[PDB]
Amino acid sequence: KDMFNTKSSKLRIEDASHNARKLGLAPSSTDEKKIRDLYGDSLTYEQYLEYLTMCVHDRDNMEELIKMFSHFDNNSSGFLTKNQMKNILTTWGDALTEQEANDALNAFSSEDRINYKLFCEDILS
């Protein structure tokens, strides 16, 4: 069975989001709020397919992703340290846990000094 009919009873937004990730999309709390604000806590099939379209984010690219990290790179050198990126990722936005942030940073590189453009390029795939 498909990802929607496995858990349907309507499907909980939170589970729709997980399915979106398995399909290679990247929903944020903004998309969850949008889909909630017009269809409630649970979506019909048709509502859920709108949500997936909502989660395509075809404006996602390296130069859009790096904006916040650039703010912290004063001399626009191109790098930030793991711990810098961890603090950023765990304080602002839809904050990750320390563990989640470190796991992403460790998977991408074994060095402390991280090219955040290449890190943003890599997490897009």
Binding site: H18, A20, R21, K22, G24, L25, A26, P27, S28, S29, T30, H57, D60, E64, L65, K67, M68, F69, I88, L89, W92, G93, D94, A95, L96, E100, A101, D103, A104, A107, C120, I123, L124
Partner: peptide, 15 residues
């Protein structure tokens, strides 16, 4: 923007 990065990091968690 940072939220876009975080959304893709969570995407990356699931296999």
């Amino acid at each position: 923007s940072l939220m876009r990065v975080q959304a893709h990091i969570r995407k990356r968690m699931v296999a």
